[PDB]
Symmetry: C3
Subunit: 29 residues, 3 copies
Amino acid sequence: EVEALEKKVAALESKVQALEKKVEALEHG
Amino acid sequence: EVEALEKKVAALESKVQALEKKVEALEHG
Amino acid sequence: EVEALEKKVAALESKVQALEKKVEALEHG
């Protein structure tokens, strides 16, 4: 379970960093 | 702790998938 | 590893809540 959580968490961090930048282009900055 | 992390991670995946689509309507696609 | 996952997950929840609100200003609401 821990290794599985590790993969899910790494994927989420990747998606969230991309989302953060996408939105940054639309507002604030 | 692991089960608790599992629930938090599943919730985040759900929120991130919805956010991804919301933003998709605004930009690229 | 578990404590490390805890920190990554807490950070993600924080970022996702902020993103959710940012986007809310742009669409639906």
